PDB file of C-alpha atoms and ligand atoms in Angstrom:
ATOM      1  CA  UNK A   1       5.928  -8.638 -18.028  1.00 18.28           C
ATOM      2  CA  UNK A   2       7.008  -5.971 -15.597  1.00 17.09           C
ATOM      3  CA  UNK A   3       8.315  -7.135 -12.108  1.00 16.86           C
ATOM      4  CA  UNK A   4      11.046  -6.302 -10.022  1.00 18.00           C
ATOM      5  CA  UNK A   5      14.052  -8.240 -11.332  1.00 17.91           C
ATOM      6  CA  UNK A   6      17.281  -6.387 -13.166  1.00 16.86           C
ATOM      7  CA  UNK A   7      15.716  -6.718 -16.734  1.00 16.58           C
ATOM      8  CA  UNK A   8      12.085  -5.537 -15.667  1.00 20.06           C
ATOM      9  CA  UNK A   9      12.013  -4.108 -12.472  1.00 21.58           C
ATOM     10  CA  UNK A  10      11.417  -0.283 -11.484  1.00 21.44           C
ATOM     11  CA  UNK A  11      14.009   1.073 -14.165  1.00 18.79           C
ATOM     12  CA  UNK A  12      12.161  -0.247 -17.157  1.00 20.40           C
ATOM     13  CA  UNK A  13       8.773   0.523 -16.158  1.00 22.76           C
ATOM     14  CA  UNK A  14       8.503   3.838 -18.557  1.00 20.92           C
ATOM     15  CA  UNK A  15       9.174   1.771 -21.217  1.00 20.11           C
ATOM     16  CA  UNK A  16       5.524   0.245 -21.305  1.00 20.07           C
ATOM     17  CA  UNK A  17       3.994   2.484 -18.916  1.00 20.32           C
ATOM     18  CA  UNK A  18       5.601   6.355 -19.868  1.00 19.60           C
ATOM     19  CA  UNK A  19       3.321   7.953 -17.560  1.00 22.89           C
ATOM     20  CA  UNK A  20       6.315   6.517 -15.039  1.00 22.55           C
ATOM     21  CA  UNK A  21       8.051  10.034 -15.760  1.00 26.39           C
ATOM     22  CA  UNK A  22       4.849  11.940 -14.679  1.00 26.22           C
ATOM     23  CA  UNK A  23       4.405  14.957 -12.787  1.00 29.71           C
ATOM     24  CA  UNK A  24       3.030  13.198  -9.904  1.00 34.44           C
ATOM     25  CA  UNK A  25       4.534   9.710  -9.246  1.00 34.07           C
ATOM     26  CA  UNK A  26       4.891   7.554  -6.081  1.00 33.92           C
ATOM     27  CA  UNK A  27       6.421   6.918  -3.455  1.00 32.98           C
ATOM     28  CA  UNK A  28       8.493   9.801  -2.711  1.00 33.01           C
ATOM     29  CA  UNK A  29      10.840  10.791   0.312  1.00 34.25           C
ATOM     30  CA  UNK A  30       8.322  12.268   2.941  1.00 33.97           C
ATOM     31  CA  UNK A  31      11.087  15.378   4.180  1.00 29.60           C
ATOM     32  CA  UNK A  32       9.268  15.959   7.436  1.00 28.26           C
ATOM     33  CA  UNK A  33      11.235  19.310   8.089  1.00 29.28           C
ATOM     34  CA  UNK A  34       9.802  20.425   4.265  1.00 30.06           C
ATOM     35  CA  UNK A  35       6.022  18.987   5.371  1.00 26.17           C
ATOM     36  CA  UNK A  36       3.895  22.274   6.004  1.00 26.93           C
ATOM     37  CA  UNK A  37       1.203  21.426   9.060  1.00 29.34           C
ATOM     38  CA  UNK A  38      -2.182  22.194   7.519  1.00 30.95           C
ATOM     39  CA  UNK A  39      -4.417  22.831  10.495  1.00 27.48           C
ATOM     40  CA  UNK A  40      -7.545  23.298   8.109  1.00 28.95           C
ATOM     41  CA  UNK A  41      -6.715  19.113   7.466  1.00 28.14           C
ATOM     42  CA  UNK A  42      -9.281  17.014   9.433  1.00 28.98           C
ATOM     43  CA  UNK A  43      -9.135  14.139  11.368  1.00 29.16           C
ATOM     44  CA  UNK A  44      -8.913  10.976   9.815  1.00 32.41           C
ATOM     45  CA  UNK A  45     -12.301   9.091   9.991  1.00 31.42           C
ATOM     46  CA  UNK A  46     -11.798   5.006   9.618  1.00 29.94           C
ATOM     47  CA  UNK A  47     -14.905   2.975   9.727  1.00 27.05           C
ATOM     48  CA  UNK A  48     -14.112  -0.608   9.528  1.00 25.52           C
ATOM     49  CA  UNK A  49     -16.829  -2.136  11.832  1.00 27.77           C
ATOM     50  CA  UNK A  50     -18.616  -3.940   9.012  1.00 27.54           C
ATOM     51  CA  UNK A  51     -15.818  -4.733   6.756  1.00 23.55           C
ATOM     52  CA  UNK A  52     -16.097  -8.092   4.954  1.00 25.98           C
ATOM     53  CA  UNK A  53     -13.073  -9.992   4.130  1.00 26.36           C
ATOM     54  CA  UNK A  54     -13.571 -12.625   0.734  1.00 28.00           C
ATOM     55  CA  UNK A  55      -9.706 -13.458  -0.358  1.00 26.22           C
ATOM     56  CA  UNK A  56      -6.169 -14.059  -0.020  1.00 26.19           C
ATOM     57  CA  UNK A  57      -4.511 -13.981  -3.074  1.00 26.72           C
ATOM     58  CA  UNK A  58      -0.754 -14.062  -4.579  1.00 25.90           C
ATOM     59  CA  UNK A  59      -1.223 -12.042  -7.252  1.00 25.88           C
ATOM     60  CA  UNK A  60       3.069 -12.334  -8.521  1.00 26.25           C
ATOM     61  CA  UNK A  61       4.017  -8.828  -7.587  1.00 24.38           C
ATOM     62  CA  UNK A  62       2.169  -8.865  -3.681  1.00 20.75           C
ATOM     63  CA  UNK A  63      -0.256 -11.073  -1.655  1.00 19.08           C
ATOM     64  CA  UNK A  64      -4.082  -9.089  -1.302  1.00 20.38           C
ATOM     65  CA  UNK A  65      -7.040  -8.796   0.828  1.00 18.97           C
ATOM     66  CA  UNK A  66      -9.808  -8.533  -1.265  1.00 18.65           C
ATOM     67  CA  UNK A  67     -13.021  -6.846   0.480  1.00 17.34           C
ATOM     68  CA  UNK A  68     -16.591  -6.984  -0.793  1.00 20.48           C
ATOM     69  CA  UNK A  69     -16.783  -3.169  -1.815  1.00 20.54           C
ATOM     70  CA  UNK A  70     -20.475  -3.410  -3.257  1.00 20.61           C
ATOM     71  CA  UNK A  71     -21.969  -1.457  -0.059  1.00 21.61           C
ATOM     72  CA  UNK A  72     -20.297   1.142   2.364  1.00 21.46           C
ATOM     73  CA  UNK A  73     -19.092  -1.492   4.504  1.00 25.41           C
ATOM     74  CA  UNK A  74     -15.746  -0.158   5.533  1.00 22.47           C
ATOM     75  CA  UNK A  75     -14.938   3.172   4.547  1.00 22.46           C
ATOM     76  CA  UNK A  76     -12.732   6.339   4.927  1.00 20.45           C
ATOM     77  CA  UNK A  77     -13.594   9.835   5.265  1.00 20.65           C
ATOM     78  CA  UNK A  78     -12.430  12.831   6.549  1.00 25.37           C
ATOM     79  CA  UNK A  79      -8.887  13.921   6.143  1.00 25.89           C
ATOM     80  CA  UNK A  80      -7.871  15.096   2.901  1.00 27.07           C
ATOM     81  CA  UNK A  81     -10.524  13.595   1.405  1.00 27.65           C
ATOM     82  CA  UNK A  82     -14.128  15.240  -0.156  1.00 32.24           C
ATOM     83  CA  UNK A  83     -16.656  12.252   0.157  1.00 29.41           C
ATOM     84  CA  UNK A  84     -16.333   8.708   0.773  1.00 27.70           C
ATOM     85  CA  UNK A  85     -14.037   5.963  -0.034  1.00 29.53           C
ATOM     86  CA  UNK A  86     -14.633   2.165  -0.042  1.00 32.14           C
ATOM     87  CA  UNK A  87     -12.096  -0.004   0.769  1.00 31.14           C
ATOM     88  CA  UNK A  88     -11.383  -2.455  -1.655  1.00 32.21           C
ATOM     89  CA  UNK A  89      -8.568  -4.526  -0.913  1.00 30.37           C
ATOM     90  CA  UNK A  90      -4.896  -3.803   1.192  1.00 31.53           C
ATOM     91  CA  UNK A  91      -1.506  -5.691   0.474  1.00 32.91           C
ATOM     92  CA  UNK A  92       2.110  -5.424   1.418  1.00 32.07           C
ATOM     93  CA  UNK A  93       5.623  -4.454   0.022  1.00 30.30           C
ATOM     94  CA  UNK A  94       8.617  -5.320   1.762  1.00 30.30           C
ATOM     95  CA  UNK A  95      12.449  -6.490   2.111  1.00 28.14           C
ATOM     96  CA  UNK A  96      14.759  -8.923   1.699  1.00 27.42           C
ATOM     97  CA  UNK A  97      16.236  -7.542   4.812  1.00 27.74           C
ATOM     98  CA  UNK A  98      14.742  -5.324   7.603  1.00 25.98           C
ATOM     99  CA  UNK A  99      16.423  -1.937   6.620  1.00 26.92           C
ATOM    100  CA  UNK A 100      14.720  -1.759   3.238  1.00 27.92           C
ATOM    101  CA  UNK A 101      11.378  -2.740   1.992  1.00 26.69           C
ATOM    102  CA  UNK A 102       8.955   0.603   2.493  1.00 25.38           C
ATOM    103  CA  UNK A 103       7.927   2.417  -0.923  1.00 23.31           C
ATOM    104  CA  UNK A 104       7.956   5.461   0.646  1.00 24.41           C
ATOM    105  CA  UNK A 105      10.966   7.007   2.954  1.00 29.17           C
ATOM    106  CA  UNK A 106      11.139   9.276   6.158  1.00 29.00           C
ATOM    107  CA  UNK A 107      13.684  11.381   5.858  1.00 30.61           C
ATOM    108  CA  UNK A 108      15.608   8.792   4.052  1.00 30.91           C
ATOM    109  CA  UNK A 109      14.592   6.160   6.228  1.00 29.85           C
ATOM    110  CA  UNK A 110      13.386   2.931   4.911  1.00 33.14           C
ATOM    111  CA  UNK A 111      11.363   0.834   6.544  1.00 39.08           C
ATOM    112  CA  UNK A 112      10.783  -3.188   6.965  1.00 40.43           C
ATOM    113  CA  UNK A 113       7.725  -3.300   5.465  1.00 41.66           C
ATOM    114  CA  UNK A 114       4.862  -0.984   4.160  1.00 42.58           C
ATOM    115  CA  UNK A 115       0.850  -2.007   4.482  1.00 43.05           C
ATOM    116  CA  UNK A 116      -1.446  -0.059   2.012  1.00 39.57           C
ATOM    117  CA  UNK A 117      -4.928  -0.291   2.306  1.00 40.32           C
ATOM    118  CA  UNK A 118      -6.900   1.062  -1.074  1.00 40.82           C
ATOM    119  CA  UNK A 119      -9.973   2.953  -1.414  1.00 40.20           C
ATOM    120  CA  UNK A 120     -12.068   4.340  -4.164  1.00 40.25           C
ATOM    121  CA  UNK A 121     -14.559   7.067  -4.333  1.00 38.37           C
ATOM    122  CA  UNK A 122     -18.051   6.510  -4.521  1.00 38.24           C
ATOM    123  CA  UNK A 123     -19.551   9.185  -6.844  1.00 38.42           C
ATOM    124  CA  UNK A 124     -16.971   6.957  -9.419  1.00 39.68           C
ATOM    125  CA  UNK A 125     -19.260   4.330  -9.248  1.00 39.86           C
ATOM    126  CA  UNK A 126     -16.379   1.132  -9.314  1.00 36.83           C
ATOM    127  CA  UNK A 127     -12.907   0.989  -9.282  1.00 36.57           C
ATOM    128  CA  UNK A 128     -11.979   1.208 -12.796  1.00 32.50           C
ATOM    129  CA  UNK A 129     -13.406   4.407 -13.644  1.00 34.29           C
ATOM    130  CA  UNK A 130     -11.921   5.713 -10.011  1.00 35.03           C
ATOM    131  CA  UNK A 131      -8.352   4.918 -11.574  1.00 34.80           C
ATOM    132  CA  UNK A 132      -9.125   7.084 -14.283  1.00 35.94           C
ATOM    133  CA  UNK A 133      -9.900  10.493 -12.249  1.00 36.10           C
ATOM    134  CA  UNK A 134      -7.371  12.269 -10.556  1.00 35.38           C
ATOM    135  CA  UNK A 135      -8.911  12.067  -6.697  1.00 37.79           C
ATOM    136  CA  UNK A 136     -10.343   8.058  -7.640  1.00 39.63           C
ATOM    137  CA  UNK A 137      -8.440   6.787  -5.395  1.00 41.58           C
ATOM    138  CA  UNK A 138      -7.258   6.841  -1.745  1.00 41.77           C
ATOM    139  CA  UNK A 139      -4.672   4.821  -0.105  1.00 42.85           C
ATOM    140  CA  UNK A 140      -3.710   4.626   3.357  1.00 40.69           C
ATOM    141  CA  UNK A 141       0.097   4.224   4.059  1.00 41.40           C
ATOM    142  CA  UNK A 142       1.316   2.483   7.233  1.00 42.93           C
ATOM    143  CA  UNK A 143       5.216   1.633   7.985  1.00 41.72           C
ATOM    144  CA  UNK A 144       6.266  -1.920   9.285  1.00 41.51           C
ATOM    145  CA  UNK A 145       9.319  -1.786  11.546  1.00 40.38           C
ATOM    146  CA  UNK A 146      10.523  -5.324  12.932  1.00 42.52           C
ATOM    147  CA  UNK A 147      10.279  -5.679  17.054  1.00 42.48           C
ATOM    148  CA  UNK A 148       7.543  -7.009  18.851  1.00 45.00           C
ATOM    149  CA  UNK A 149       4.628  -9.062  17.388  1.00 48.03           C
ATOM    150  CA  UNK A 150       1.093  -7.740  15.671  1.00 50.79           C
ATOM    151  CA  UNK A 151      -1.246 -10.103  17.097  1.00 54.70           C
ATOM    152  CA  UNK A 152      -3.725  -8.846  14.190  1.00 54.27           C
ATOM    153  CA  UNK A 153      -1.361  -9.603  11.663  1.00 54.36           C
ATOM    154  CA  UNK A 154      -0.942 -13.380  12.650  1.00 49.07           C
ATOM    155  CA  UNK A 155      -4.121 -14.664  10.935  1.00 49.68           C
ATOM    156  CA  UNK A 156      -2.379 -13.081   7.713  1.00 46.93           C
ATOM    157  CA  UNK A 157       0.919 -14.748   8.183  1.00 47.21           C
ATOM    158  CA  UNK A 158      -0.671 -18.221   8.954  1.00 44.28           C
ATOM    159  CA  UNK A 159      -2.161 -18.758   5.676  1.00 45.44           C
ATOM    160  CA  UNK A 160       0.815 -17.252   3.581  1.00 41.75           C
ATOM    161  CA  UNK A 161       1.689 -21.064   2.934  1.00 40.96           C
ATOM    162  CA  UNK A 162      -1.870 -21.833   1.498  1.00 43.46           C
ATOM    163  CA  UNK A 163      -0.610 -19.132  -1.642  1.00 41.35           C
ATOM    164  CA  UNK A 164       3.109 -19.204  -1.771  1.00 42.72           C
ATOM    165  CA  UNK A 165       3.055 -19.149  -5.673  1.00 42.02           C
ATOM    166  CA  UNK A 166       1.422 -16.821  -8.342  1.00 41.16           C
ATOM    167  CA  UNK A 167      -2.043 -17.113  -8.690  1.00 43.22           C
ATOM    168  CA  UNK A 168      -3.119 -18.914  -5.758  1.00 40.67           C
ATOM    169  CA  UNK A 169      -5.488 -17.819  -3.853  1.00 40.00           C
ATOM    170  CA  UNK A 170      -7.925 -19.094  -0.617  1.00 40.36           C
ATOM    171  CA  UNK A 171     -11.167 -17.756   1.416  1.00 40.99           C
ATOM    172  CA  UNK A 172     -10.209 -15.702   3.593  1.00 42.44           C
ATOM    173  CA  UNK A 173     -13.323 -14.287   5.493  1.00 43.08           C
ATOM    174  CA  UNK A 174     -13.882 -12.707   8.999  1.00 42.66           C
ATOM    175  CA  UNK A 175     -10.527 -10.640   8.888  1.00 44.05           C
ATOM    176  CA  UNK A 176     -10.839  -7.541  10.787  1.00 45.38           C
ATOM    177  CA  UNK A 177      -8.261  -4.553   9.164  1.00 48.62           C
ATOM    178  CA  UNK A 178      -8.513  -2.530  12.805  1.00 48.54           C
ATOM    179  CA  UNK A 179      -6.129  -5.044  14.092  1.00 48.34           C
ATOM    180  CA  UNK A 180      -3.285  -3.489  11.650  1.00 47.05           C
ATOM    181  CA  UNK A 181      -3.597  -0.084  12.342  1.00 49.27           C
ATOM    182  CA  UNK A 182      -1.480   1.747  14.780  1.00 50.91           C
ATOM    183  CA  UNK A 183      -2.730   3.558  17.647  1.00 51.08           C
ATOM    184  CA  UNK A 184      -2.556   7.482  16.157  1.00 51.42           C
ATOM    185  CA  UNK A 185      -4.101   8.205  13.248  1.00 54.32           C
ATOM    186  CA  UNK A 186      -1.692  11.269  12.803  1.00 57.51           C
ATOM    187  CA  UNK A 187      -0.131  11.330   9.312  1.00 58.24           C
ATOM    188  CA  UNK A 188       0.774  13.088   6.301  1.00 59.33           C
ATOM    189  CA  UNK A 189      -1.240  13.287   2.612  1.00 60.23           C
ATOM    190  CA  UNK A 190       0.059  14.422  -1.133  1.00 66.72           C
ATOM    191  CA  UNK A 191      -1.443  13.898  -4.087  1.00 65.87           C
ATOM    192  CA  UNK A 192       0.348  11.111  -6.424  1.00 66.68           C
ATOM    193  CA  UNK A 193       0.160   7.256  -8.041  1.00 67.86           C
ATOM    194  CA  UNK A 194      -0.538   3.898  -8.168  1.00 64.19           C
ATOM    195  CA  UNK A 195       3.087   2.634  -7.227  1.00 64.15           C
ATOM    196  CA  UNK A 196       2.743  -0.451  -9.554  1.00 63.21           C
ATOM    197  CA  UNK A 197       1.566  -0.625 -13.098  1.00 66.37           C
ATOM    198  CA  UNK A 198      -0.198   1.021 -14.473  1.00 61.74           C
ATOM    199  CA  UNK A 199       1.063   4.005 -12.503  1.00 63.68           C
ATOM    200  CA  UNK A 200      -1.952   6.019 -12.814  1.00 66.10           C
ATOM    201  CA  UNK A 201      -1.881   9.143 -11.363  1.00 68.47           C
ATOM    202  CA  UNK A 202      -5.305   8.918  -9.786  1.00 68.69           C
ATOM    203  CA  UNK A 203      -3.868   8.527  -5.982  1.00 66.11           C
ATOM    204  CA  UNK A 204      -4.621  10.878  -2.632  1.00 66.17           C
ATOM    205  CA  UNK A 205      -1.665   9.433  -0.447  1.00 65.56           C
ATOM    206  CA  UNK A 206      -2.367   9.290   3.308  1.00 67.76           C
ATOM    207  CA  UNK A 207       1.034   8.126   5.027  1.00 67.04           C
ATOM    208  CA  UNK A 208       0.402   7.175   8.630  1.00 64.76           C
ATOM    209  CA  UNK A 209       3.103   9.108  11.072  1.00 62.96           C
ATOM    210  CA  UNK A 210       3.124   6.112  13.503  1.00 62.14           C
ATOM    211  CA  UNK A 211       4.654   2.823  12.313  1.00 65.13           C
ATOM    212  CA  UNK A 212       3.225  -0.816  14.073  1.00 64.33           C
ATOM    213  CA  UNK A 213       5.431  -3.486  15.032  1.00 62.45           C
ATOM    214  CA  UNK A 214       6.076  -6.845  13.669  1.00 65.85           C
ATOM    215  CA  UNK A 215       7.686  -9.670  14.586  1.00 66.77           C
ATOM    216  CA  UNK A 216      11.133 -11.249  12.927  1.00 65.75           C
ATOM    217  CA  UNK A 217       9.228 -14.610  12.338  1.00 63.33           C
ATOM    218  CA  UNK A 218       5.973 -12.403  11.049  1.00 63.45           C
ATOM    219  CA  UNK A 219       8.127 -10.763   8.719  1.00 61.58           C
ATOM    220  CA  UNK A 220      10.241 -13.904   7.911  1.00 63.36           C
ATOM    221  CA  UNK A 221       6.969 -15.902   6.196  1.00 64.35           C
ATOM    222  CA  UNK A 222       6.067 -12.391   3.467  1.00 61.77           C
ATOM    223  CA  UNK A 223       9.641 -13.702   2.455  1.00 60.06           C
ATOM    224  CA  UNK A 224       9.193 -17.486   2.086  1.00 56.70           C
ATOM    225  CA  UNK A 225       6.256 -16.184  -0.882  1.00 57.11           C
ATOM    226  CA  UNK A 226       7.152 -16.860  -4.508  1.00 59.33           C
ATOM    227  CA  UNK A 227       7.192 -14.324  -7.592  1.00 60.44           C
ATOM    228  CA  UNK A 228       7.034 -16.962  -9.526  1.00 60.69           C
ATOM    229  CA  UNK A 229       4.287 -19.360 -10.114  1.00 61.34           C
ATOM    230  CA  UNK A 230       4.017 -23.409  -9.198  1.00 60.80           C
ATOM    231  CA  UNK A 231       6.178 -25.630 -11.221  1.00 59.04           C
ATOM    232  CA  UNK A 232       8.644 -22.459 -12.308  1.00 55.29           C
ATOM    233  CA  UNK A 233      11.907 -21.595 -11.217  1.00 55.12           C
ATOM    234  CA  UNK A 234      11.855 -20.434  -7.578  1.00 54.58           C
ATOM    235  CA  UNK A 235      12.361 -16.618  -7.300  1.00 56.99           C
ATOM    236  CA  UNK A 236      11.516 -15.500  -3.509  1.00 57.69           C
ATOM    237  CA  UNK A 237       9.037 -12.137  -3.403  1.00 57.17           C
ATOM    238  CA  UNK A 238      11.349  -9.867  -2.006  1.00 56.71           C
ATOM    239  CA  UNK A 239      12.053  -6.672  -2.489  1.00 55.51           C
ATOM    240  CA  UNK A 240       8.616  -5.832  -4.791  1.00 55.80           C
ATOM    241  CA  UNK A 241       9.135  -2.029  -3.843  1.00 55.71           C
ATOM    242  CA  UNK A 242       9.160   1.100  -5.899  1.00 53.52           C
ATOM    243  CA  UNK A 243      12.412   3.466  -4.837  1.00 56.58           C
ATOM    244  CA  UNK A 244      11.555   6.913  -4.354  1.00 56.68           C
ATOM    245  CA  UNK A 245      10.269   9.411  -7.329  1.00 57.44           C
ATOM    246  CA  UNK A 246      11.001  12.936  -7.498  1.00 57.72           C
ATOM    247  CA  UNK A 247       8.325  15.372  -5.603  1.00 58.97           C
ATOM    248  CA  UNK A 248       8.543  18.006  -8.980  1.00 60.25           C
ATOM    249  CA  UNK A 249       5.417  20.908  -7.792  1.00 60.32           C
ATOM    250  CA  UNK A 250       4.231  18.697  -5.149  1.00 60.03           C
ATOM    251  CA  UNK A 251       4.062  20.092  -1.609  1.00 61.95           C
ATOM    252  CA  UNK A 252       3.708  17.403   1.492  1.00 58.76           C
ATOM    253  CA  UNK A 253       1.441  18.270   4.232  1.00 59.48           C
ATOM    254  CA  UNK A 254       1.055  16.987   7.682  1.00 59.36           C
ATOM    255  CA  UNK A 255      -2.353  17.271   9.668  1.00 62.88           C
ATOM    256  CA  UNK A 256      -0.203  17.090  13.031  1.00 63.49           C
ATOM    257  CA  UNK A 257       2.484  19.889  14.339  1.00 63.24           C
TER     258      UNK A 257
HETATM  259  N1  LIG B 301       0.804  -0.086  -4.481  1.00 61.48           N
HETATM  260  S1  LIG B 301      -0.513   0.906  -4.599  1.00 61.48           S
HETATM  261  O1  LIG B 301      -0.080   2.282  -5.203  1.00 61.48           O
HETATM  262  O2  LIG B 301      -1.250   0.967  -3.227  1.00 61.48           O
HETATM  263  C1  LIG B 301      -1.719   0.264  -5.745  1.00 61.48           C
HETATM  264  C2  LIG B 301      -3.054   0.353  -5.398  1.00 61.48           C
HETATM  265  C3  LIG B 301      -4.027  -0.121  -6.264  1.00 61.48           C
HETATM  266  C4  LIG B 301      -3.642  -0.676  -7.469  1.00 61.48           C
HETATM  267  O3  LIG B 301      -4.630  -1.151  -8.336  1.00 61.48           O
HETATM  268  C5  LIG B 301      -2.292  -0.760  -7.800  1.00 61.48           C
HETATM  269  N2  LIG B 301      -1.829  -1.329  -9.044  1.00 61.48           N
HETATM  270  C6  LIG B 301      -2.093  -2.718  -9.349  1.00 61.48           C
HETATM  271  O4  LIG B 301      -2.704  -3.398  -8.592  1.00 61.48           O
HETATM  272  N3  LIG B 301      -1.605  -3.260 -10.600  1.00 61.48           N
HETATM  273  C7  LIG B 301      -1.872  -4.655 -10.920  1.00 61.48           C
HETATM  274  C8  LIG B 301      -1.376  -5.029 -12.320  1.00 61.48           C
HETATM  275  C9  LIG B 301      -2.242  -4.466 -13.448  1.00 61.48           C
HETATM  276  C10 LIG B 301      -1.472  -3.451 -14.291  1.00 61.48           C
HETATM  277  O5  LIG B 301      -1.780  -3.615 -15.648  1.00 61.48           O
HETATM  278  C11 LIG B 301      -1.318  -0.282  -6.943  1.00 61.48           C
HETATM  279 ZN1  LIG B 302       1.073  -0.843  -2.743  1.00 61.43          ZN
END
């Protein structure tokens, strides 16, 4: 099974998965002198107000929200994008320390932590025939740096213990995604993948300019989490991040100058 150890981690990937040595695979290094403002790019239109939260989950690789996505309930628009998105689920990637744990880099800069909330069009019709079409999908970027406390990140963090092994998973309803999202919507956008398997090249990237702040202790409990599932050797999820892929005939651009 792929993962992020020595013997199956990021290296390996192609092996099962070729399309790992695409034309458009993710993350990359966002080179922010390189990044062309686009002033024809729109604002960024989130619409969260009716989002419903189902589950937590530890899925071995990450922990997930999972939203109900059966009605435009939470959505994004605008931007980049042509038509609407539903959001779907968001999860994490981060460190086993605080200078590395971001997929994707600023100017070589890594980050604690990186949140990515995933959408899929709607003329697609569901998810899995969204990951199959080269705009299906559309997920929204935003970088963790360690410092002072997200208070809307705390209900997350307090039932990490409830799924600290593979495959467990617990309600998690009434969870409001505007609490993680910093104040400017300002950001950058390329097209690209899924950053896990299957690696499907199906991804509009929107990278949020502005980082939020967590806490040392917030951060601290995504590390006590297990790859592994119960009654298996302990392996601590850390470091379940995908370095940097090359950019090939991929130009970055920013909607802000
Ligand atoms: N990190 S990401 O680019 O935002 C991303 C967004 C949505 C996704 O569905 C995946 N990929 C995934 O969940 N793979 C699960 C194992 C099945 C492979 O057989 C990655
Ligand atoms: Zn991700």
């Amino acid at each position: 099974h792929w993962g992020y150890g020595k013997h199956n981690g990021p290296e390996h990937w192609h092996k099962d998965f070729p399309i790992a040595k695409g034309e458009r695979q993710s993350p990359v290094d966002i080179d922010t002198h390189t990044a062309k403002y686009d002033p024809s790019l729109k604002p960024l239109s989130v619409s969260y107000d009716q989002a419903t939260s189902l589950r937590i989950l530890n899925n071995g690789h990450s922990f997930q929200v999972t939203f109900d996505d059966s009605q435009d309930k939470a959505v994004l628009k605008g931007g980049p994008l042509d038509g609407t998105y539903r959001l779907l689920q968001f999860h994490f990637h981060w460190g086993s320390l605080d200078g590395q744990g971001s997929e994707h880099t600023v100017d070589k800069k890594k980050y604690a932590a990186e949140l990515h909330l995933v959408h899929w069009n709607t003329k697609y019709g569901d998810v899995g025939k969204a990951v199959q079409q080269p705009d299906g999908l559309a997920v929204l970027g935003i970088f963790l740096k360690v410092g002072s406390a997200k208070p809307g990140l705390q209900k997350v963090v307090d039932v990490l213990d409830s799924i600290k092994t593979e495959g467990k998973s617990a309600d998690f309803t009434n969870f409001d995604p505007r609490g993680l999202l910093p104040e400017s919507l300002d950001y950058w956008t390329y097209p690209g993948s899924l950053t896990t398997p299957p690696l499907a090249e199906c991804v509009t990237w929107i990278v949020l300019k502005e980082p939020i702040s967590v806490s040392s202790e917030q951060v601290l409990k995504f590390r006590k989490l297990n790859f592994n599932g119960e009654g298996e050797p302990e392996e601590l999820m850390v470091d379940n991040w995908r370095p940097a892929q090359p950019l090939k005939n991929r130009q970055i651009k920013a909607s802000f100058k």
